[PDB]
Design a protein around this ligand. Structure first.
Ligand SMILES: OC[C@@H](O)[C@@H](O)[C@H](O)[C@@H](O)CO
Ligand SMILES: OC[C@@H](O)[C@@H](O)[C@H](O)[C@@H](O)CO
Ligand SMILES: OC[C@@H](O)[C@@H](O)[C@H](O)[C@@H](O)CO
Ligand SMILES: OC[C@@H](O)[C@@H](O)[C@H](O)[C@@H](O)CO
Ligand SMILES: [Mg+2]
Ligand SMILES: [Mg+2]
Ligand SMILES: [Mg+2]
Ligand SMILES: [Mg+2]
Lengths: 393, 393, 393, 393
């Protein structure tokens, strides 16, 4: 398995650039030059790179510094052919953002935050990015009386609709992707799961250009099924981008390599991304982005190894998932279990509620004890998927 | 503290009627006669009672049996004055519902399930209920390949829109409330949290009459903040009903008495229900329903005690929450922390995006290190709330 | 892969015999006759069967009836050659055990529970079991003030030490194994994890014949690493029996087939049971017992599919774990990462604390910054294990 | 409630001194001078201060510098009267400890870590500390094949037994206390809970002077009951020190003020530390140490507010826990529920196992169905505790 640019594997500058500081220790690695990151990733087979404004341009950068850095990074992009499909803003590291950007209780800070986003849209637009991600990491609270929860959602909405109105006004070819996270760094974060992000988009004035950017480990930090959550996003046609990594349980966000967390869930996520729904429906078509962090125990050989492991894991899972659905035994097990039967509408063509209540066969004369005898054989279908994942089939 | 019918405390027949069987043991209590439940609850100060069709009418009940039971229960209601504000359907106990009702993979079963709901709407309508709850407990999977996830949401939608169309057609004065749960009895349940239920309603043809019925312990089984979740439901004007109980962590659904789980979260939920949002906004106005189970260790004296503890807990929390917001020290702490400041729009009246980017004060000349110096004093506001909850203030 | 009796796969009568009642529904399958259970297990290649006293003999059975049941049961064992390696007692289903067996607050229930246990030991010895398991499923509380926590531990010890002295007194060749569970059916169970069970055994008077029976899903309900937990039990030489199954996360105990939960963790569990430790040490040589439940959506074909599947999964993982450790690339990866280096003592033969203190190259003269540059290459090592797991290496 | 030195409230230098860097941001507060820390703690009523070697003396400090820092530090202690009851070592921040101190895969890091510890013991003794705490924060792994799990336990034991023999050899009046943590910063930490720490101590050669230092938030990260866990440590008489703080659920370690996490559990923790066990037994008489971090959104006023708040919370709970146990209605509720009955031995003085077996009224003649009717009244008992907690009784 060898990734080619046709695979659409994208990486953030902050992933291979993550230096290693965590809550109990300092960096274990020297900073990564952005020019090097770009060359290195292009040599491994990446398709693109993504960044936060401050990953590249320091917060306090003078104008001359910004131009230099941008000339160096654009040179690197020209030399290697990497695309920049997504750009995001850092509204969480500077001390000013301690209570949030968009939903900070201080209004002057909310204004700076939105100003900082608006300027970043311009940059995003000039880099040719198709997606603009918003991860509101500091949007939340540690304590329940810190916020007016209705006002917090109004403030979030104001910021997101202002950013979207500006895109439309400027004619930029960008969509906004919101990225949910249940906690960390705040005790509770606003719009904690895929459902909460999707719900919120529906209250927006400009929701047509707003969708989601779900991350594997974020959903698993609430103990949810990542595959079920991205399936709901898909079904509502709101799956704009995806962040792939691994997580080993409900705890701090590990950011492991994709497939290095819950393996069977990783298998079924790849199947959904590659094979789509068994009865048909929308398919996800954007980048396969890896938002992970190389363990701080490992030196730079490990960094490149970890980048490579992401693409290898995905390609290996993909091979198994295509083999799995192509197997005739699996197709037969699917039919037996009623997977295709779920796709037939419950009612008949032009059958109303009144018509159904009235059908004796469906209710009054329905044999419930006889229907309950069906062996759905879900265990057997599960055994067949796992044997295909282990390559023994 | 003494609950009066003016408090609007409602109880399901299945809560005080829960006999005690769990996964590792049989019932520890004799069945409860429905007539007795009604009299007993009216003597404690309940306002109303709620039930599942099969809580009252056995699954296999003949016509003569159904009429008898309904005559007995309506007599009881007439004698005591209890209301029946909510009615729900049991789509989870019979073996026929092993793969779901609405999203069972077997189509004949989906038809029976919907037929069973339609008939129950009639009953609900005749009892004078304002709310019809749907809890899809068997809607989900243990294994990721058991379902076509897009088809499962189509099947759910078909059932919910059919039920809603029927309400409209019949002219019934009922709204449907969907009730999320992340897991148990299925490994993963569809529409696992408040966000997922709200998202789903937006894809519905008849979503205008569809809202939510969140339960305290269900949200806490995913480790979410119950108060933040009901605040999002409120803000979207979808909080139709509420299920109150207690939960002590991420584990099986305990169904403890309300306030017998996370106490501080219970305190802030009561504040939200009674005081509303600090800057104003919608207020929840329906029943305060308790969906709990009297621990199986306790005899019938304990059952009535537990029913009474629910209303006492709520009334005690309410007293403290009204005291808390009326305290001048708390009002001052709120202002200091920026709780009211969150309520001011970020932009000025007729200030566009372009106008803001352009304001030098907001961005280019903004002093970020100086803004970051504000002491938000959230800890102190948290200390004041807890001292009010402990009654030491 | 075809299991054979030399593989030492054992199954509980209650696993395949679980009819499907859960907290929200009744059984979906007919009761399984235990003579049939024995014949079917033996045809599939199991080596032995285990049971709870009340799995085979009803709680109400007369002596005549107990003799009758046991003669047919022993006949079936004789007909097939299945061993009975472990016997256990049901101290959780009858309403009498609602506050516990050994730690019930009621003294007369404690005496009844201990007498039930002692009689069961006599049957255990009579069947040729080498192990007597104790799962204190109802030992615990929902509420913190329900028990004196020190008296509960004194009553647990009295119960286990009386049973242990009785084995010793009668000279049975039996060992007691305690089985920890964090919760379910109690809100909090005493001795919730492997560590608590191990610690508790060291306070017993007859500790020498008391060890543990860890269960995969139980440590995963506290988000613990099952391989790390059983490693600690093995290190202490207290791993007397093991229960294998699957769990997808912190939620109710699912009891899925082994390998249908956390797959990568199942791989490393199999590596420790089969291969042991990289530098050498203890090895577990007991039976490989499956304590799971066939999903309620499936009929009896699914029941035997599911029993087969446990054995398949273990042999597939066993195979990939042998290939993995045998691989020269893996052995060199382990060497680079310092796996064998951890096996060397920190101190030199005869070096004292004073000596080390005083050795300037280990402290005063140590180059901590040089030492920190080591690439441990843990990411690469993990990528090698998963490629062996996925059958690509 | 005003704390006074007799209350024995102790604080770590790193608690009030935590500047706010978390995984997604930099410090929000200026470094706290430790002489100032001492003066401020003493003004608020603390009894003592604790510190990690590198909290006071930089890792790079010259001997001259170490002497300088220590003279001002000892002067401040002398000026104020604060004791130094516990001392600990930092074996986690420097990049050298990226794979652990005692269990690092690198042998030369293991020697450096042990020498760092031994020197620190000398300082501990010199300061008059009675307790030396060991938190093995980096002892663990992200991946299961990174370590030989048996060698890791041998290296942990070598390290703790060398330090213990050195105390014994020098005759210091010091005890070692191990502090368990399930995860963070390692994906899995060795000795993850109270039970694992207790079990581990029983395999040490110098076990007699080794006990535990449980931390509220750490057991709550595995969803365990902190009162049950510390009850087991106390029962074994291994509760040598305690770390008090708050945690809202299974997620990253929050380190909130004691009482700002699970309030009801904090109430029962305070009851066990202050009141002990209902039937009598061991009591914890050590210092009440606060291991928390002031939230990063707050300035230094919030820092001293937060330190005050820990002491307020403990005295408010202490007060309500004394009122609770003193209450004659509670004492009768406890009596009904069998709390004192659990304190009676199961067996009669001189009754053997044979005797009990053979006592027909405890088994053959037992009315199990009669016995099961007992109302244990646990719900009522819990309602009484919360009404005392809420200050309504
Ligand atoms: O939890 C961190 C988060 O996942 C971060 O890497 C976001 O993805 C980024 O801020 C937006 O792309
Ligand atoms: O988890 C069980 C669920 O909470 C049940 O009691 C629903 O609320 C009821 O089916 C609808 O009202
Ligand atoms: O949670 C159920 C438990 O795992 C049970 O099946 C014990 O293993 C059995 O009682 C002892 O063998
Ligand atoms: O998770 C941090 C840990 O709780 C730490 O502050 C230890 O308590 C300290 O290192 C030993 O005292
Ligand atoms: Mg991300
Ligand atoms: Mg409910
Ligand atoms: Mg078991
Ligand atoms: Mg600590």
């Amino acid at each position: 398995v060898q990734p080619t640019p046709a695979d659409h594997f994208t990486f953030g500058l902050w992933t291979v650039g993550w230096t290693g500081a965590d809550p109990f220790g300092v960096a274990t690695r020297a900073n990564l030059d952005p020019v090097e990151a770009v060359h290195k990733l292009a040599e491994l087979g990446a398709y693109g790179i993504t960044f936060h404004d401050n990953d590249l341009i320091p917060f306090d950068a003078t104008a001359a510094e910004r131009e230099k850095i941008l000339g160096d990074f654009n040179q690197a992009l020209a030399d290697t052919g990497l695309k920049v499909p997504m750009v995001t803003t850092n509204l969480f590291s500077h001390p000013v953002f301690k209570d949030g950007g968009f939903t900070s209780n201080d209004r002057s800070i909310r204004r700076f935050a939105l100003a900082k986003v608006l300027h970043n849209i311009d940059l995003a637009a000039e880099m040719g990015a198709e997606t603009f991600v918003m991860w509101g990491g500091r949007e939340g609270s540690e304590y329940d009386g810190s916020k007016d929860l209705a006002a917090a959602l109004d403030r979030m909405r104001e910021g997101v609709d202002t950013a979207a109105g500006y895109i439309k006004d400027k004619g930029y070819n960008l969509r906004i992707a919101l990225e949910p996270k249940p906690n960390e760094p705040r005790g509770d974060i606003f719009l904690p799961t895929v459902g909460h992000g999707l719900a919120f988009i529906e209250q927006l004035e400009h929701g047509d250009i707003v969708g989601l950017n779900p991350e594997t480990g974020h959903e698993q930090m609430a103990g949810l099924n990542f595959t079920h959550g991205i399936a709901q996003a898909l079904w509502a046609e709101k799956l704009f981008h995806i962040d792939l990594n691994g997580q080993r349980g409900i705890k701090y966000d590990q950011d492991l390599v994709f497939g290095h967390g819950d393996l069977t869930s990783a298998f079924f996520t790849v199947d959904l991304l590659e094979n789509g729904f068994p009865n048909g429906g929308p398919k996800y078509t954007g980048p396969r982005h890896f938002d992970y962090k190389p363990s701080r125990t490992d030196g730079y050989d490990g960094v490149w190894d970890s980048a490579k492991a992401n693409m290898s894991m995905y390609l290996l899972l993909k091979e198994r998932a295509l083999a799995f659905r192509a197997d005739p035994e699996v197709q037969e097990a699917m039919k037996t279990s009623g997977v295709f039967e779920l796709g037939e509408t419950t009612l008949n063509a032009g059958e109303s509620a009144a018509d159904l209540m009235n059908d004796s066969a469906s209710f009054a004369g329905f044999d419930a004890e006889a229907a309950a005898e069906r062996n759905f054989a879900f265990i057997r279908l599960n055994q067949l998927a796992i044997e295909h994942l282990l390559g023994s089939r």
